[PDB]
C-alpha cells in the first residue's frame, strides 16, 4: 500500500485537520477511541493509507500537529477525537508569533522544527511506500506560513521524490482578517512555489458566499466551513482509499494538472451542495453535478474563473454513475464553452471515478481547476504588498527578527513573475 503523512500547522491548520480526521474516521468506521466498527471490508482493507494499526483494533491516524504555542492543539486534544491521536505526535513550543512570518520561519520555528522533523522521519519509517505529504496550513499565519514554509523545504530536502501538496488558506479579496497579510503571504509564496508540487487555494471569503447562498445558511460557523473543506480533501484521496473504475493516484493528479512546474495552484470545488430545504427538488444526475462543478459561484477559491482560461481540470466522482454520462457530459462542457479553455491543450479534462460515495450522497464530485484566473489573486497580493512595502510599513517586525530586506524584494520578484507567467499563457496561442 501507499501511505500519506498528514501534517497540520497553525491554529487554522489544526482546526481544519481536526474536522478532517473526523470525516475520515467516519468514512472508515473508526470511532473516537480508534476502534473499528465499520460495515464494509473496504473501509478496513485500505485503511493503511492514513491510519497506522497500532495494536489490537486501535488505529492511529498518522498525523502530526504543529504549532508554536499551546491553546490550540490543546483544544484539539480536549475535543471528540483528541484521544484518537498519539500524544507523541503533538509537537509545539511555548511562544507565539502574532502573524510574524519571520518568527515562524526563523527565530522561533528554527527551534521547533528540530523536533517536528524527527517525528516526521519516524512516521515515514513506519511506511511501506510513502505516497507523499499533505500539509494543512493557512497563509498569513505566523505559524501556518512561517513553519509551514519551513517544513516544506525541509521535507523535500529528504524526500525529493514524494508528492507534496498543501491546502492553503489564502488571503481574502475583501476584508482582511490580519494586518500584515500581504507580507506573510508573499514571503511564504516566495518559497512555496519552488517546493510544493501542487497546492490548493481556499478562501474563507468564497466559502461564506457559498454558505449564505447555495447552502442557505445563516450561521456559517467555522466548524461548518471546515467541514466543507474537509469534504474536498477527502475526495482528493478517495482513489487511494477505495476501489473504483478510474483510480487516480495522487501523483497522477499532479501529472495531469501541472503543465509547468511553478504553475501549480488550484481552485477546488465540490458538488452537490444543495441545502436541505431544497434537496427534495433535485435530481442528482451527472449533468446536475457538472452544472455545479463548473459554476463559478461554487469555486472555493475567491477568484472568478470566468475571466481566465483553464489549463486543465480534474473531475473526481464518487459513488455510482455511468462512464458514458460522465465522459459525454464533460465533453459537452468543453464544446459549449470552448473559449474558457486553453487551445494549447486538447482535452482539458481529466476524470476519475470511485465507487464509494460520501455518506448520504449517492453521487458526488470534486473539482480541481487550474485556471489562469488565479493570476487575479496574486495580482491583488502584489499590489497590496508594494503599497505597504514602499512605506516600509511594519517592516521592523521582520527586520528585528533578522530578516534581510532583500528577501522582500526577491519575494516580490517571484510573485510578479508568477503573474507574468499566467498572463503569458493566458493569451498565448498555438499559431
Amino acid at each position: 500500500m501507499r501511505e500519506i503523512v498528514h501534517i497540520q500547522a497553525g491554529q487554522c491548520g489544526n482546526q481544519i485537520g481536526a474536522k478532517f480526521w473526523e470525516v475520515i474516521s467516519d468514512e472508515h468506521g473508526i470511532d473516537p477511541t480508534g476502534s473499528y466498527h465499520g460495515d464494509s471490508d473496504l473501509q478496513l482493507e485500505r485503511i493503511n493509507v492514513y491510519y497506522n494499526e497500532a495494536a489490537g483494533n486501535k488505529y492511529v491516524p498518522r498525523a502530526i500537529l504543529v504549532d508554536l504555542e499551546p491553546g490550540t492543539m490543546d483544544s484539539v486534544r480536549s475535543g471528540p477525537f483528541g484521544q484518537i491521536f498519539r500524544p507523541d505526535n503533538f509537537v509545539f513550543g511555548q511562544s507565539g508569533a502574532g502573524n510574524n512570518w519571520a518568527k515562524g520561519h526563523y527565530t522561533e520555528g528554527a527551534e521547533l522544527v528540530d523536533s517536528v522533523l524527527d517525528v516526521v522521519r519516524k512516521e515515514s519509517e513506519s511506511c511501506d511506500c510513502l505516497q507523499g505529504f499533505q500539509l494543512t496550513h493557512s497563509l498569513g499565519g505566523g505559524t501556518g506560513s512561517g513553519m509551514g514554509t519551513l517544513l516544506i523545504s525541509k521535507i523535500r530536502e529528504e524526500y525529493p521524490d514524494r508528492i507534496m501538496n498543501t491546502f492553503s488558506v489564502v488571503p481574502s479579496p475583501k476584508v482582511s482578517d490580519t494586518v500584515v497579510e500581504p507580507y506573510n503571504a508573499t514571503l511564504s509564496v516566495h518559497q512555496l512555489v519552488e517546493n510544493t508540487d501542487e497546492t490548493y487555494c481556499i478562501d474563507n471569503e468564497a466559502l461564506y458566499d457559498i454558505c449564505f447562498r447555495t447552502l442557505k445558511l445563516t450561521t456559517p460557523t467555522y466548524g461548518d466551513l471546515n467541514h466543507l473543506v474537509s469534504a474536498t480533501m477527502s475526495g482528493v484521496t478517495t482513489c487511494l482509499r477505495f476501489p473504483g473504475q478510474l483510480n487516480a493516484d495522487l501523483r497522477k493528479l499532479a501529472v495531469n494538472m501541472v503543465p509547468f512546474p511553478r504553475l501549480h495552484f488550484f481552485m477546488p470545488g465540490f458538488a452537490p451542495l444543495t441545502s436541505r430545504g431544497s434537496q427534495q427538488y433535485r435530481a442528482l444526475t451527472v449533468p446536475e453535478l457538472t452544472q455545479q462543478m463548473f459554476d463559478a459561484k461554487n469555486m472555493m477559491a475567491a477568484c472568478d474563473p470566468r475571466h481566465g482560461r483553464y489549463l486543465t481540470v480534474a473531475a473526481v466522482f464518487r459513488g455510482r454513475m455511468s462512464m458514458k454520462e460522465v465522459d459525454e457530459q464533460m465533453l459537452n462542457v468543453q464544446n459549449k464553452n470552448s473559449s474558457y479553455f486553453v487551445e494549447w491543450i486538447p482535452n482539458n479534462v481529466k476524470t476519475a471515478v470511485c465507487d464509494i460515495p460520501p455518506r448520504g450522497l449517492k453521487m458526488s464530485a470534486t473539482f480541481i481547476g487550474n485556471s489562469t484566473a488565479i493570476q487575479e489573486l496574486f495580482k491583488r497580493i502584489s499590489e497590496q504588498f508594494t503599497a505597504m512595502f514602499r512605506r516600509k510599513a511594519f517592516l521592523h517586525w521582520y527586520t528585528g527578527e533578522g530578516m534581510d530586506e532583500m528577501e522582500f524584494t526577491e519575494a516580490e520578484s517571484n510573485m510578479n513573475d508568477l503573474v507574468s507567467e499566467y498572463q503569458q499563457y493566458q493569451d498565448a496561442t498555438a499559431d
Partner: protein, 431 residues
C-alpha cells in the same frame, strides 16, 4: 497442442481480462473454483487435482486493481504469482512505466512468463491487453514487448488496445503517452487491434438501446470480440484459422498493422424477437460505419484487408454470397488487393453471460479490418501532440524520469512517416 498466453496490463488490461476470463470459464463450463463438474489446453492448465488454471499474467503497478481480482469471485482461478503488482503506478507517465518504475518489475514478469511458456507444447503467441495513455498500459507494455520479442522472436505478438478516442477524455497527457508507445510498438508487435470507448458508447446507445453503460459491460462487449477470435483454436469449425494466419491475412506491409474491429449482431432481446438475423443480414451490418468499434468513418479511406469470423449456424455458400454482394457495393478497396476476404467459420455459436445486456444469437460475425481510413485517426493524434509539444506542456514530467527530450522528436518523426505510409498505400497504384 495449440497454446496461448494472455497478458493483461494496467487498469484496462486487467479489468478487461476479468470480463474475458469470466467468459472463457462460462464457455468451457469451468466453475470459479477451477472445477469442471475437450478443448481447454490452450488457455488452461491442469493441476494435480485436475483443477484448471488459466494461462495469463496480470501486471499492474497499481495493486488496487489486482486486489479487486484477488478478493473477487474468480480469486480461486489464479495462481497467486500470476498476479503481479507494484507499489506505485505510473501516473499516466510513459517514462515511469518504461524507464523508472516498470524497469524494476519487468524482470519478475518475464520470469513468470517464461515459466508459463515452459509448460507449453506449442505456443502460438501472446495476447496483450493495454491502453494507450495509461502509464502502465502504455509505458510498461512498451518495455514488455521490447523484451518479449527477444526471447520469442517467432511467436505471434497480438495485442488489443484502447485507442484514445478522438473526442473523449479521461487523461490529459494521452497523446504523449500514446505516441511514445506507438513509436516502439511498431517494431515488435505483429498486429494490434484498435478499440475506441467512444465508438462503443454509440453502439450501446443505438444497437443495445441502453443508456448509462460502464466498463462492467463495455468490457463485456469487448470480450465477445476476443472470444470470437480465439474460438478458432478452442472449437472445431469448417474453416479454422490459426493465430499465425492473421499476420498473413491482415498485414501487407510490416509497419502497418492496426486492424479495426467490429462485431455483429449487437442487439437487445427486444429487437431480436422482431428481427431475423440471417447470415447476409449480419454480414451487411459489419460494413455499416455505425457499427465499427473505432471512431473512423471507413468510407473516408479504402480497405486493405478484411477478415471475417463466423460463429454458429452459418453456411459456406451463403457466406460466399454475402461477400460477393459486399464486393458489389461500390466500399472501396486498394488496387494492391484483389481479394480482401479471408474467412473463418466456427461451429461453436456465441454464448451469453447471465446478467448481460446482449441477446443470445444463433450466429455472429466478428470482423477485423485493415483500412487506410485509420490514417485520419493517426493524424488527429499527431496534431494534438504537436500542439502540446510546441509549448512543451507537461514535458518536465517525462524528462524528470530520465526521458530524453529528443526522444519526443524521434517518436514524432516516425509517426509522420507512418501517416505517410498510409497515404502511399492508398495511392491506387497504376502504370
Amino acid at each position: 497442442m495449440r497454446e496461448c498466453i494472455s497478458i493483461h496490463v494496467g487498469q484496462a488490461g486487467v479489468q478487461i481480462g476479468n470480463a474475458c476470463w469470466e467468459l472463457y470459464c462460462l464457455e468451457h463450463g469451468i466453475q470459479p473454483d477451477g472445477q469442471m463438474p475437450d478443448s481447454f489446453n490452450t488457455f488452461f492448465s491442469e493441476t494435480g487435482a485436475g483443477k484448471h488454471v488459466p494461462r495469463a499474467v496480470f501486471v499492474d503497478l497499481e495493486p488496487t486493481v489486482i486486489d479487486e481480482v484477488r478478493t473477487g469471485t474468480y480469486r480461486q482461478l489464479f495462481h497467486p504469482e500470476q498476479l503481479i503488482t507494484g507499489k506505485e503506478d505510473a501516473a499516466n507517465n510513459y517514462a515511469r512505466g518504461h524507464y523508472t518504475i516498470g524497469k524494476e518489475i519487468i524482470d519478475l514478469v518475464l520470469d513468470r512468463i517464461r515459466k508459463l511458456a515452459d509448460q507449453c507444447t506449442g505456443l502460438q503467441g501472446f495476447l496483450v491487453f493495454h491502453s494507450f495513455g495509461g502509464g502502465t498500459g502504455s509505458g510498461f507494455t512498451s518495455l514488455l514487448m521490447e523484451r518479449l520479442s527477444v526471447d520469442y522472436g517467432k511467436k505471434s505478438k497480438l495485442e488489443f488496445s484502447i485507442y484514445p478516442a478522438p473526442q473523449v477524455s479521461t487523461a490529459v497527457v494521452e497523446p504523449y503517452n500514446s505516441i511514445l508507445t506507438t513509436h516502439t510498438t511498431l517494431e515488435h508487435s505483429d498486429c494490434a487491434f484498435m478499440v475506441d470507448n467512444e465508438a462503443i458508447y454509440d453502439i450501446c446507445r443505438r444497437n443495445l438501446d441502453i443508456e448509462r453503460p460502464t466498463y462492467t459491460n463495455l468490457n463485456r462487449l469487448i470480450s465477445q470480440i476476443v472470444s470470437s477470435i480465439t474460438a478458432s483454436l478452442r472449437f472445431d469449425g469448417a474453416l479454422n484459422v490459426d493465430l499465425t494466419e492473421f499476420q498473413t491475412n491482415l498485414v501487407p506491409y510490416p509497419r502497418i498493422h492496426f486492424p479495426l474491429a467490429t462485431y455483429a449482431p449487437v442487439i437487445s432481446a427486444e429487437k431480436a424477437y422482431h428481427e431475423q438475423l440471417s447470415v447476409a443480414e449480419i454480414t451487411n451490418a459489419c460494413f455499416e460505419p455505425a457499427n465499427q468499434m473505432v471512431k473512423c468513418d471507413p468510407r473516408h479511406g479504402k480497405y486493405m484487408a478484411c477478415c471475417l469470423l463466423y460463429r454458429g449456424d452459418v453456411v459456406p455458400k451463403d457466406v460466399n454470397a454475402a461477400i460477393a454482394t459486399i464486393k458489389t457495393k461500390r466500399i472501396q478497396f486498394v488496387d494492391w488487393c484483389p481479394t480482401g476476404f479471408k474467412v473463418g467459420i466456427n461451429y461453436q455459436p456465441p454464448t451469453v453471460v447471465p446478467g448481460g445486456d446482449l441477446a443470445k444469437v444463433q450466429r455472429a460475425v466478428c470482423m477485423l479490418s485493415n483500412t487506410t481510413a485509420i490514417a485520419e485517426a493517426w493524424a488527429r493524434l499527431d496534431h494534438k501532440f504537436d500542439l502540446m509539444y510546441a509549448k512543451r506542456a507537461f514535458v518536465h514530467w517525462y524528462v524528470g524520469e530520465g526521458m530524453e527530450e529528443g526522444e519526443f522528436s524521434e517518436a514524432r518523426e516516425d509517426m509522420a512517416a507512418l501517416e505517410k505510409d498510409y497515404e502511399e498505400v492508398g495511392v491506387d497504384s497504376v502504370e
